[PDB]
């Protein structure tokens, strides 16, 4: 689970 903006 990667982090993504918005």
């Amino acid at each position: 689970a990667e982090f993504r903006h918005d």
Partner: antibody
Amino acid sequence: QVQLVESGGGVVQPGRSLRLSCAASGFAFSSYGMHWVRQAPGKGLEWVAVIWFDGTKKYYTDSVKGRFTISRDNSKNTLYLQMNTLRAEDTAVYYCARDRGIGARRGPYYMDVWGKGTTVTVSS
Amino acid sequence: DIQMTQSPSSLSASVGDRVTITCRASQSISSYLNWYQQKPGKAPKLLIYAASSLQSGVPSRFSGSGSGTDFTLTISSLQPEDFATYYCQQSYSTPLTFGGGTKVEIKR
């Protein structure tokens, strides 16, 4: 005088471990996210890992998942990188960098302050 | 994972010239694009964040433009100190990725 100072680098054999440290001074450490960025000899910049300001979220580049662990001790103003099961291709200069963050969750934005770096050589 | 393609990998220029570099992203990163300068043996230095915002203290000659997938770094009139390597970096989603680097060398 805001400073980031890496230490812990050296010569290490493949499959062995190394702990990098990064001592922060001159600002509010526990309010910034921190990154580890590396540069293999003669190559470009490669992102390694980020840890949130509160130490609650951690992300890693794929080639180091399950081998590297990023941690922080906000009390000691110190960032750490635990490097297990080292390979030759981990040979690089390692930099820590602070990231202020953006958005509601304070995810990465930009890296305005860097350390001078510490050199890791993985060789038998 | 987003790929950052930087072009050209090298270029020659002389003092006073206008130089531009390009970073292209394999998919939209909105405007979470940063530009760094690095000289041999030294740590990177942030020049531009958020595609166009300029880091406090950086000369006014440096400018950046772009959104989505195409981005530009501009030096208005070159200076002797500017001959260095420039990397772009997307800050939209992990894993964070840098471009390959663009070396700015002295023309002769």
